[PDB]
Every structure is written in structure tokens, then in C-alpha cells.
Amino acid sequence: DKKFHGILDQGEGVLIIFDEPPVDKTYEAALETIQNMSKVVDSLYNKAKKLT
Amino acid sequence: LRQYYLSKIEELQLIVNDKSQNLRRLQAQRNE
Amino acid sequence: KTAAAAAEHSQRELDTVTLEDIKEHVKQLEKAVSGKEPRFVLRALRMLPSTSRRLNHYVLYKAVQGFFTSNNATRDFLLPFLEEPMDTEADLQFRPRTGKAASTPLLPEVEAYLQLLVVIFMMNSKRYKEAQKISDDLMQKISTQNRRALDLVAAKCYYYHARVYEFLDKLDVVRSFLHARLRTATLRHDADGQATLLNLLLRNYLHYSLYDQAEKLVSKSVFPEQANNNEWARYLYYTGRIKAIQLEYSEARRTMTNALRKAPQHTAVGFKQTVHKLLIVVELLLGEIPDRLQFRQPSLKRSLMPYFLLTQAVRTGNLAKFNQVLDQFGEKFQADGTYTLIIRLRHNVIKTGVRMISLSYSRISLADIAQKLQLDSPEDAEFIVAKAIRDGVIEASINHEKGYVQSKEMIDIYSTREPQLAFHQRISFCLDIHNMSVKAMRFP
Amino acid sequence: DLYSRYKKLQQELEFLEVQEEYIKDEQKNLKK
Amino acid sequence: DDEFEEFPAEDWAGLDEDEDAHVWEDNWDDDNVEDDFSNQLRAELEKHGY
Amino acid sequence: YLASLIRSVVALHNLINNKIANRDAEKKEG
Amino acid sequence: PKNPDLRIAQLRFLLSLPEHRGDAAVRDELMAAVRDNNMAPYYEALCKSLDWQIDVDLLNKMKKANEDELKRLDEELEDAEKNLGESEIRDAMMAKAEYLCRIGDKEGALTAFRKTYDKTVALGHRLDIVFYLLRIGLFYMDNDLITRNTEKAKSLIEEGGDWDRRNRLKVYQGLYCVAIRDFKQAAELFLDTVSTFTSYELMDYKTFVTYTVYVSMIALERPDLREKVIKGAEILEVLHSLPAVRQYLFSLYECRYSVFFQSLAVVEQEMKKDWLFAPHYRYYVREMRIHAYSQLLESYRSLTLGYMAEAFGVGVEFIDQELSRFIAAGRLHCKIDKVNEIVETNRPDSKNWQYQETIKKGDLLLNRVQKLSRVINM
Amino acid sequence: FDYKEQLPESAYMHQLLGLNLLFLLSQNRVAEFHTELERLPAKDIQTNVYIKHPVSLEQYLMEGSYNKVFLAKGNIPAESYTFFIDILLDTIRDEIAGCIEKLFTEATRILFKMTDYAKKREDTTIPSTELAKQVIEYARQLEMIV
């Protein structure tokens, strides 16, 4: 349930505690930009197809 | 020498045109 | 019969529209000649199939008489060879060319355009003798001159000539002209002529299964990258087939998928079927399950249904099912052109299984793997796993001391030094697109 | 003729090259 | 815009009555050989009960 | 990726518009 | 109730494909069809089922009698009164079409409805006609007709809807559950679980909620579904009388897998003999198994197969077999280690997944860019 | 291969060619092995006592079923062929020898002559220069011919 960050290794009967790497915004912004450019590419495709 | 002399003329005519419209493109954005 | 009158009216309308369109392409040719801009001739080639059949023999004769009003040697020689039409009183006077226009001789571009139009007409007519003769005359007419503008249409001219000669099974005869004309184009660097000529030269061997010759002609030849999309697709298909028969599989599959993607989305139903079929066989041979999405496409359904059966059988790994499917569909397989690779599959089936096992597990006892792959021997399992590692399909080192089959390690190069190499190709391609775009800005 | 045409096109190619560089230099200077 | 008449256009081969296929979209693992699930647990369980 | 994509799309659009404009002008001239 | 019964449709499927369920439901279906003189469907019903009995005449006599009565009545009304548009003549022959749908075949009913549509001048009286037509189409399982009718009703006419769309939501959901598209449309289109109209097509509110819970589980295993189904007010309220469904849902949620598996077995058995068994019988079961394994595997990195088997009860070897097949499938990130009977969770991390998504999105965009560039610069 | 369809061909369609096949791998290459295998038009799968074995070998070796042949490798229903069957059976040895390079003294049971076989026989530096080259090329193309 994401009450806290961690993981369990049943192999050794050990519980691991750590934190989740926060610095990730670059790739999210990049993926959004890619989708926007995909829409623009579709638009230019439409312009070219409508007008040779 | 129509086989060759004409061979060279085309070999240096079609190509040289590409350096004609290229001059405009360099001329176009320059003014812009 | 009112139907006959309606059909005659429709033919007259089509002929008038075709005359107008022919005048339009003639104007395009004149503009391209004046300005050294073959964009119009590329447009004419692109729209060439659309104008394949809208006239009649008498309409063509009258059009030629009206157009080649110039004392053209080509028309003068061709007219006597053409069968003389029966005496007809109805002879419309078509003189679009008067004064300077009539005096100016008709350009070889226009002459070749009309000749290839007659080629298409009597092609649908299946007039093989006259097609061949006209092609030869066109060949002499092209060879007399050395103008690049002509090759633009001459390429499709060669294509149609070759298509005619294929019916006659005269590929062994064409080969001489094909080779010579390819040599000439190469000595002149005619991109489109070279593309089509290389394509047909390859096609000959492909139909005649001279695969060593084809390999020579593909490796030693050079394909310019500026070629058309369609010719690129054909080249990729033929190269993929040659490689796949050549027992090299990874490059063949990569190229075949690239060509299939490049291929037209809605047109060329049969050709797309063939390319998909060869790619399907290659993928199955390379131990990868194909995409089930294709096998449900309405456009490529029944030509593959046997191949859907084959892929299901191979995945299930049932020898009886594979044998029965072969026994039931061998004739179709031969017809397609995949019997050799399928015979290869018939014993290479176990490779896909070893790949799947070595991909799903991380350490398997050798006896367990033997039980998994129905070999009935730990030694056989060891040999097979060594084979899997050797061929480069799995990346696990086998330890014949504790029955271990150790797979790869933890985080691989794909998060340490791989992403940079990955991005370099993308950036190079994007910059290339931009540079081509800017350099292709405009003529004026 | 057939050699004079070739000489004319050679000279013209030379003189177009002698401009395809000047325009670019002017473009750099104007960007500055 | 090309007819791309490479040569062949498959003629539907064994064109017959439409199987009606299925509008659902299906992956590869869809069709297998199995003995259901409830029977699976049933041939299962026993011994100590699975 | 981002810079190359942006510049590529921008260049494509610029070429599209320039060619469209010049083709229409030349066609309408005569 | 209204419309040719979807209950009759389910009985048709039962006396149909289910090859072991033909014992007493056959009797119920036959003795319910004999009443009301549905000669058209009864033809094919007898063709598939037992040979025949001498009752077809004894029913179709009065069936044609009533048909002739209605035809004479409405035709006489039309001839006597020249009223056009929304006239009692149209009411009457639409009633005739209603009877024709109720007893006779599909083609005649569709022709009748097409004929009666042209006279429609009331938007509500046309929306209800479209509802009837889609009900019949669902009854006979004609995908093309269903899609055409649904799209038409939704788009062309759904502008002054007096909250009839709730019914359109339910019919959309029936369609998208017939189609294996169980996730997006099938989940969202069960937001209107507050259905005052215990619709005809709905076998009952209990069956509606059971379908809602099954589709909710399949579309959202535990992806913050609890805020919609686990804590769902009306969902729970009805659930209290459906002990089996409550057991299944709460077993998946609370992580009681030994009982989740028995719940899934019972759900598969029950869905077998259902009018939505074709697209789920094995697909829904497999997806649920995968989601259960995935949920358990999360929160863990290494799991001894003994522990996994025990959590699932027992059947260690079966756990190996299923895990192997599923991992091979291309999902459920994990790698089995036979020599020690331990599994490992090799889940990609945030950066790795982000980059492996960016690479492919960029691949698609660059291919598109290249194709466009080739198209231009002819 | 019929430079020209003639009429009398009674040896390579049977006792021969298939030896070329032997040589089509005898060395170790395969290209040809699988290339010409289109000529034998169709009787290849139709069999003829000939190609059959010359072909069975690779079908019974490519998988890795090395033993699939040694055992009854003596199935040579044609001309000697022995002139390479062993010449090829030799490669297998060297190939199977390939084995997690780097069975202790028991040797490979598919081959084991005794001990005459015993006689038989970036990571950590980030690439600076190459990356500098590639990046500077990026910059060059970015700022270049206006």
C-alpha cells in the first residue's frame, strides 16, 4: 500500500529499508514533450496529405 | 566526340545547376 | 442498344480527359527540360499507373498523328510497322501544334511517354510481340541520345518491358540488356534508372534461383540512398529473401521488418502478403514468436492461415502436429517460396524452446532442463545448452560440476554505457533529417 | 562549340564557387 | 502512389465460408491445450490438499 | 533526443510551408 | 422482462453450447417458449434441440391469428383516418412490430422497425425505438447491428436526453463486456451503478453488481480500486447478499490467497455457463491469476517457492510450472532459480523504465519523421 | 546443374553432387551447403538414397545432435564419400572441442586417439577520446553551413 518504502527478501528473512530516488522529472517532461511532438507530427502529416 | 564531349558537358551542367539554386537559398535567408 | 451508346460516350469522355492529361504531362516535361527540374517528371511517374488504360488503338493512332506533326524519324519508322487500320471516314483533325509549336520537333520525353502509354494499352491487350518490338525501338531511341531527363520515364519503360518479357519467360534473354543498361546507368550515375535496373536484375535471379549470382550482384553493387521508397522496399525484400535462404537470419529479419514497415500500408496486398510470410518464417526460424496481431488482419488472412497453423504448431512443439501440417500444406508452402526454411525449422524447433527456457529461468538443473525439452539425457541437455550459447541465442555459462546453468548477471551495460551509444544514432538521424530539410528548401 | 560550351561551364562553375563562399562569410559576419 | 504489381496478389487460396473470426483482439497465448482450472485444482488438492 | 526532435520537426514544417507557398505561386503565375 | 427476454437468450445458450447442461433448463426453456407462441425462434430451437413435437401448428395457428388481428386493426385505422406523422395508426403498427419482434424472427422485426422509424417525430419515441432495436440485436448477438445502432443512438440523437443515457450506459457496458474490452470502457461504464431503472436487459440488480465487481477486479486489481469498489456504498450494500462475490473480492484485496484461488475457480465455473463466457472463460481467469501473482510478488525481492506455495496452499510443482509459463509469456517480471527453489524480483527501476519508454517513443516518432521527409522532397 | 537441359545424367542426381554437398560443409562452411540445396528441385525431400544422407547429416547436426550422426554415420549408400565424411567428421571434433573454453580427465564421451586430443591444445575506463569526437561532431553539425 506504499505505507513506507522498502522491500522484503524472504531468502534471508531480512527486511530492507531505503528511500525512493526522487530526482526523475527530466524523463517525465521529455516523454510529455515527445507525445506533444507526436501530435504535431500527425498534424503536419494531415497538412501534407490534404495538400501535396 | 559526341559520346564523350557531350558526356562531360552534362557531367558539369546538371551538377552546376545545383550550385545555382543553392546560391539563392544562401541568398534568401541572408536578406531575411 | 442504349448500353452501347453509353459505353461509347464513356470511352469518348475518357479519351478526351486523357488527351488533356497528356497535354498536361507534356507541359510538365517542357518545364522540367527548361528549368532542369525533374520534379514534374517524378510527378508524372507517380501518377503513371493512374493513366494506364483510358484509350483505344485508333485513338492512339490519331493522337500520334496529331502530336508528332514534326518529321520525326521515330514516328516515320514506327508507322509502317504498325498494322494499318481499315479505311475509316471519321478522322478528326487534331492539330494542337501550329506554327512554332508544330515546327519544333516533338521531344523524346513526350515520344517515350506516348510510347510507354501504348505499351500499357497493348500490354493489357497482352500484345507481346509488338510490346517487345516497341521496347527495342525505345531502347535504340534512348541509346541514340544521352539526356538524363529521358531516363526518368525510361526507367518505368524498362520496367514495363521487363514485365512483358517475364510472361514470355525470356529472362535469360533480357539479362544481357539488363546488365548492359545497368552498366551504362552506372557510368552515368542515373539514380532512378539504376534503382529499377538493379531491382529487375535481382528479380531475374530470384525467380531463377541463381542465389550465388544474386549475392554477387548485391554485395558488389552499390545502391544509392536517394532512391525512391518503392524501389527501396523492393530492394529490401529481395535482399531479405536472399539472406534468409543464405542461413544468415538476424540481419535478414531486421531488413525484412524494415522493408515491411516501409511498404505501402493499404496497397500491394499480395506483395505485402509475401513479405509478411517470409518474415514470419524467418522469425520462427530465429526462435522468436511472431506478432499475433498480423494473423488476424483481414487484408492478409487466408494467404497466411496455413502459416498461423504452422506457428501455433511450432510454439506448442508437437512433432505430430508439425508433420501433419506439413503433410497438409506442402503444396502451398512450395508455391509461396519457403519450403527450404521450413525444412530447416522441422529440426530447428528445439532452439525456440531452449531460448524460452533460458529466458524464463535463471538457474536450471541440467536434469530438469532435459525433462523440460524432452531429450531424455543430461548429456544431450549439456550439448544443447552449449549449442544455445555458441549460436549466440542465450548468454548463460554452463557449469558441468553442479548442474548449474548460470544466466547473466545483475544490471547490464544498458544502464552504464549503453544509453549514450543508443542516443548517438537517434541524434545523428535527426540532424540528418534537419540538414536534408534545410538543403531541400526551394529552387527560386 | 562543343569544347567552348565546356569551357564556358567550367568558368561558370568556378565563378559560382567564388560566390558560394562569400555569401556564407557574409552570413557569419551578419550573425555576429 | 504505385500499384506495386510485383507479380502476385494472393487469390484468397481456399476462400470458403467465413469463420466469422472474432472481433475481440487476442494475443498468442490465447489458445493452448489445458484441462480447465477447477479440474486443475481438483486433480490438485488430494494428499494434504492443495 | 529533445533538441534534435524539436529542430527536425521545426525544419520539416518550415520546408513544408516554403514549398507550398512557392508551388502555389508558380502554379498561379502561369 | 420487456423485449424478447435476454433470460430466454441465456437459456438458449445453455441448451446450446454447454454440452453437459441440458438436463432441466431444457425443460424450463421449452415450456416457457411453448407459451407466447414464438414460432420463429422455436424453429431453430427445435432444430438444435430435440427432434420435434406436434405443437408448432397448435401454436402458429393462433400466432398468425393474432398477427392478422393486429394487421387488420391498424390497417383499418390507417385507412379510415388519414392522420399521418404521430398518429394512432403509427402507434398501432408499431405495436404490431413489437409483437413481431416478440414472437417472430430477426429479419421481419428489423424490417418492421425500419418502416416505423420513418414516421417518428418524437425524439423520445425514437430513442426508445433504438433501445428496442439494440435490445433485439444483443439478443441475437449481431455485432455489426449492435455497433451501428449504438453509435447512431449515442451520436445523432443523444442531445436532449432526459437522463435516458443511464440506460445507454448499461447497454454500452453490455456491448463492451461482450467484446473482450473489459478494462477501459467496461470499467468506466460501470460508474452508473446507481441504477434506479432495474433495466430489462439487466438480469437483476444482483447480476448487474456481480458483473460490475468482476469487471472491476479484472480492469483494476488493486490500483486504488478500493476507493471505488471496496468502499463502494451501494456495491457493498448489494454485496452483503452475494457471499461468493464478497469472498472473491475481499480475498483478492485483503491478501488471503488460499481462498482467492478457490474464489477464482468458482468464478470461472460460474462464468462458463454465462452469456459472456466466450471472451473470459480462460482469458479473464488467466489475467486474474497473473494479477494475483504480481500483487504477491511485489513487496518482495526473493521468495522461497515453499512460501509461495503455502500462501497458495500447496502445489509447489504447479507453482513452478505456472510461474515458468507466465514469465515466458512476457509479463510478471521475475526469474526462477531452480537449484535453490528461490525466485527473484528483477523489477526495472524508475530511471530504467523511463529510458526504455523514451527510447521506443522516440523510435516511433523518428520513423514517422523519416516517412514524412521522404514524402516531401519528391 | 545443367548448363543446358540435355538427357544423360546418372551419377550426381544419385551417387554424386551429394558429395559436393559433403564438400558443401566438409570444410566447415554452410553457405553453399544451403545454397545449391534449391537445385535438387524437389526430389531432395522426395529422397533418392542420395542427397538424403548428405542432407540428413546437417539436419541431424545443426541442432547440435552431434551424436545423431557418429552413431550410424556409416550410412553411406553411395560413392566412397568417405573421402570427406571423416574429413567432415573431423570438424565436429574440433567444433565440439569448442566447449566453455577456459569433463576433467574423462574427456567428451562423444569423442572420448587417447590424449592425442589432449595434445591438440567500457569496463573501467570511460572512453574519453571517442566520446569527445562524437560530441564535437554534434556541435559541428549544429553550427555549420548557414
- Domain map (residue ranges) of chain E: 1-48
Among the listed residues F6, A35, G356, the one whose alpha carbon sits nearest the alpha carbon of residue C427: F6
Nearest CA in chain A to F12: A44
Quick one: cell of E24?
475481440
CA atoms within 13 A on the CB side of C2: 0
Please answer yes or no on whether C147 and B10 come within 8 Å at the CB atom: yes
DSSP H/E element including H80:
none
The amino acid occupying position C398 is: I
- Give yes or no for a contact between G133 and G147, defined as CB atoms under 8 angstroms apart: no
Residues 6+ positions from H91 with CB-CB distance below 8 Å: H25, H26, H27, H28
**Cα atoms in the Cβ-side hemisphere of radius 13 Å centred on G185:** 14
* Same domain for C334 and C430: no
Residue of chain F minimizing CA distance to A36: F6
Nearest-5° Cα angle at E25, E24 to E26: 115
In whole angstroms, give the CA distance from residue G190 to residue G218. 13
Note whether C242 and C346 are same-domain residues: yes
3-state secondary structure of G320: helix
Cα C391 from Cα C383, distance rounded (Å)? 12
Write out the three cell numbers for G209.
453488481
Nearest chain G residue to A28 by CA: give it: G354
Looking at the DSSP bridge assignments, the partners of residue A7 are A16
Nearest-CA distance F3 → chain A (Å):
10
Query: Is C434 within 8 Å of chain F by CB?
Result: yes
DSSP assignments along C305-349, one per residue: HHHHHHHHHHHHT-HHHHHHHHHHHHHHHHHHT-HHHHHHHHHHH
Burial class (CB in 10 A: 0-12, 13-18, 19+), C188: middle
Whether residue G179 and residue E24 make contact (CB cut-off 8 A), yes or no, is yes
Which chains contact E through at least 3 pairs of Cβ atoms less than 8 Å apart? C, G
3-state secondary structure of F1: coil
Q: What are phi and psi of C259, to 5 degrees?
A: -65, -45
From the candidates G302, G333, G337, G338, which should be mutated to test the interface with C, based on the most C CB atoms within 10 A? G338
Q: Which residues of H96-112 are buried (b: 16+ CB within 10 A; e: fewer)?
A: beeeeeeeeeeebeeee
Task: Tell me the nearest-neighbour CA distance from F29 into chain A, angstroms.
Answer: 18
How many Å apart are CA C233 and CA C272, to the nearest integer? 10
Which residues does a gap of C–N over 2.5 Å follow in chain B? Answer: none
Separation of CA H92 from chain center: 9
Residue C427, chain F, CB below 8 Å: the answer is yes
DSSP calls for C192-239:
HHHHHHHHHHHHHHHHHT-HHHHHHHHHHS---TT--HHHHHHHHHHH
Q: Which chains touch F (3 or more CB pairs under 8 A)?
A: A, C, G
Residues 6 or more apart from G99 whose CB is under 8 A from it?
G66, G67, G70
Of A34, A37, A47, the CB nearest to F16: A47
What are the residues whose beta carbons fall under 8 Å from the beta carbon of C224, sequence distance 6 or more? C191, C194, C195
Partner E, chain C 234-253, Cβ-Cβ below 8 Å: 234
Which residues on adjacent β-strands are paired with residue C170? none
Contact at 8 Å (CB) between B14 and C33?
Answer: no
Residue written as cell 522469425?
C283
CA distance C151 to C32: 13
For residue D22, list chain B residues with Cβ-Cβ distance below 8 A: none
Helix (H/G/I), strand (E/B), else coil: G223: coil
Going C87 to C93 to C95 to C99, the CA torsion angle's sign is positive
Distance CA C370, CA C379 (A): 9
C-alpha C202/C-alpha G168 separation (Å) is 59
Pair C58, C14: CB distance under 8 Å:
no
What is the rounded CA–CA span in Å between residue G328 and residue G294? 14
Whether residue C339 is found in the same domain as residue C418? no
In terms of domains, do C417 and C354 share one? no
Taking the Cβ of residue F15 and every Cβ of chain A, the question of whether any pair is shorter than 8 Å is answered with: no
- Tell me if C283 sits within 8 A of C352, measured CB to CB: no
Q: How many CA atoms lie within 13 A of G212 on its CB side?
A: 30
Geometric angle at alpha carbon G342, from G336 and G345, rounded to 5°: 60
Q: How far is C261 from chain F (nearest CA, A)?
A: 21
The C-alpha cell at G366 is 523518428
Cell triple for C199: 531491382
Q: Which residue is listed with cell 449504438? A: G150
- Cα G252 to Cα G218: distance, rounded to the nearest angstrom: 11
From the list E24, E37, E50, the residue facing G315 with the nearest CB is E50
Q: Please provide residue G222's backbone torsions phi and psi, each rounded to the nearest 5 degrees.
A: -140, 40
User: Which residues in chain H (126-145) have CB-CB distances under 8 A to chain D?
Assistant: 145
Asked how this structure was determined, the answer is: cryo-EM
Q: How far is CA A9 from the centre of its chain?
A: 27
Strands A6-9 and G300-304: parallel
Instruction: Kindly calculate the radius of gyration of chain E based on its CA atoms and give it in whole angstroms.
Output: 23
Q: How far apart are alpha carbons G348 and A51 in whole angstroms?
A: 45
Which of G350, G316, G322 minimizes the C-alpha distance to G334? G322
Which residues 151-170 on chain G approach chain F with CB closer than 8 angstroms?
none
Cell numbers describing residue C99? 506554327
Neighbouring-strand partners of residue A14: A9
* Cβ proximity of C352 and C312 under 8 Å: no
Compute the distance between CA of residue C351 and CA of residue C353 in angstroms, rounded to an integer.
5
Q: Which of G67, G149, G146 is nearest to G105 (CA)?
A: G67
What are the start-end ranges of the H helices in C47-107? 57-67, 73-81, 100-103
Is the CB of residue G369 less than 8 Å away from at least one CB of chain C?
Answer: yes
Residues C336, C285 within the same domain: yes
Q: How far is CA C310 from the centre of its chain?
A: 26
Q: C369, C358 in Cβ contact below 8 A?
A: no
CB-nearest partner of F5 from A37, A47, A48: A37
What secondary structure does DSSP assign to C239-264, as a single string?
HHHHHHHTT--HHHHHHHHHHHHHS-
Please name the residue of chain F whose CA is at the shortest distance from the CA of residue A39: F9
| Residues of chain G contacting residue C422, judged by C-beta atoms under 8 Å apart | 359
CA distance G369 to chain A (A): 7
Tracing cell 544474386 back to the chain, one arrives at: C214
Q: Which three cell numbers stand for residue G325?
A: 509459463
Burial level of H113, CB count in 10 A (0-12/13-18/19+)? exposed
**How many other C-beta atoms lie within 10 A of the C-beta of residue C158?**
27
Strand arrangement, sheet containing G300-304 = A14-17, A6-9, G300-304, G342-344, G335-337, C361-363
Q: Is the CB of residue G201 less than 8 Å from the CB of residue G138?
A: yes
Which residue out of F13, F18, F19, F27 would a mutagenesis test of the A interface target, given it has the greatest number of A Cβ atoms within 10 Å?
F13
Distance CA H141, CA F8 (A): 13
Together in a domain, C417 and C340 = no
Q: Which three cell numbers stand for residue G12?
A: 438458449
Rounded to a whole number of angstroms, the CA Rg of chain H reads 25
- For C221-253, b/e burial (b = at least 16 CB within 10 A) is eebeeebbebbbbbbbbbbbbbbbbbbebeebb
- Nearest CB among B6, B17, B28 relative to C146 is that of B6
Pair C386, H100: CB distance under 8 Å: yes
Q: Which of G61, G141, G133, G152 has its CA nearest to residue G94?
A: G133
Report yes or no: A37 at the F interface, CB cutoff 8 Å: yes
Q: CA dist C111 to C108, C130, C134, C145, C177, Å?
A: 5, 17, 12, 13, 21
- Cell numbers representing residue F4 in the block: 534534435
Which contiguous run of DSSP H or E holds residue C399? Answer: strand C397-399
Q: Do A37 and G365 touch (CB under 8 A)?
A: yes
Smallest CA–CA distance, residue F27 to chain C, in Å, is 11
Q: Phi and psi for G282 in degrees, rounded to 5?
A: -125, -30
Place of cell 548557414: H146
Report the gap between the CA of B8 and the closest CA in chain D (Å).
7
Contact partners, residue A26, CB within 8 Å, separation at least 6 = none
Among C310, C345, C311, smallest CA distance to C328 is for C310
- Residue G120 vs residues G75, G78, G94, G114, G155: alpha-carbon distances, Å: 18, 16, 10, 11, 17
User: Is the separation of the CB atoms in C252 and C288 below 8 Å?
Assistant: no
G227 DSSP assignment: I
Minimum-distance CB partner of C146 among B7, B21, B25:
B7
Entry resolution (Å): 3.8
Residues of G in contact with A34 (CB under 8 A): 358, 361-362, 365
Cell 419482434, residue located: G101
Same domain, C293 and C350: yes
Q: G78: alpha, beta or left, given left = phi > 0 and alpha = psi -120 to 50?
A: alpha
Q: Is H7 on the interface with C (CB under 8 A)?
A: no
DSSP H12: T
Cα C23 from Cα C110, distance rounded (Å): 9
Alpha-carbon gap, residue C43 to C25, rounded angstroms: 9
CB C251 within 8 A of CB C215: no
C-alpha cell at H61: 547436426
By C-alpha distance, the chain C residue nearest B18 is: C443
Chain G residues touching F1 at Cβ < 8 A: 358, 362
Contact partners, residue C434, CB within 8 Å, separation at least 6: F4, F7, F8, F11
Q: Sort strands C361-363 and G335-337 into parallel, antiparallel or unpaired.
A: parallel
Considering only CB atoms, A40 lies closest to which of F2, F9, F20, namely F9
* Amino acid letter, D32: K
Element (H, E) at C353: helix C339-360
Q: Residue B28: closest CA among chain D residues belongs to which residue?
A: D23
My answer on whether C274 and C358 are in the same domain is yes
Judge contact between C114 and C22, C-beta under 8 A. yes
φ, ψ for residue G337 (rounded to 5)? -120, 90
In angstroms, the CA G15 to CA G41 distance is 14
The secondary structure of C123-153 as a DSSP string is HHTT-HHHHHHHHHHHHHHHHH---HHHHHH
- CA–CA gap between residue G105 and residue G39 (Å, rounded): 8
Name the residue facing B17 among C36, C439, C441 (closest C-beta).
C36
Hey, CA dihedral for C284, C289, C291, C297, is it positive or negative? positive
Q: Which domain holds residue C249?
A: 237-366
Interface size, chain E vs chain G, as Cβ–Cβ contacts under 8 Å: 38
Which of C356, C364, C430 lies closest to G328 in CB terms? C356
Give the span between the Cα atoms of F8 and F11, in whole angstroms. Answer: 5
Alpha-helical runs (H) found in G35-142: 39-48, 56-80, 88-103, 106-117, 123-140
Whole-angstrom CA distances from G378 to B23, C46, G53, H10, H109 are: 21, 10, 74, 58, 65
With CA atoms as reference, report the closest residue to H95 among H18, H27, H35. H27
Residue recorded with cell 527478501: A9
Residue H60 sits at the vertex; the CA angle it makes with H54 and H62, to the nearest 5 degrees, is 100
Residues of chain D with C-beta less than 8 angstroms from the C-beta of H146: 24, 27-28, 31
Q: Is C163 on the interface with E (CB under 8 A)?
A: yes
DSSP tag of C397 = E
Residue C142 CA to residue C153 CA, distance in Å, equals 11
DSSP letter, residue G69: H
**DSSP H/E element including E18:** none
Contact G98, G109 (CB under 8 A): no
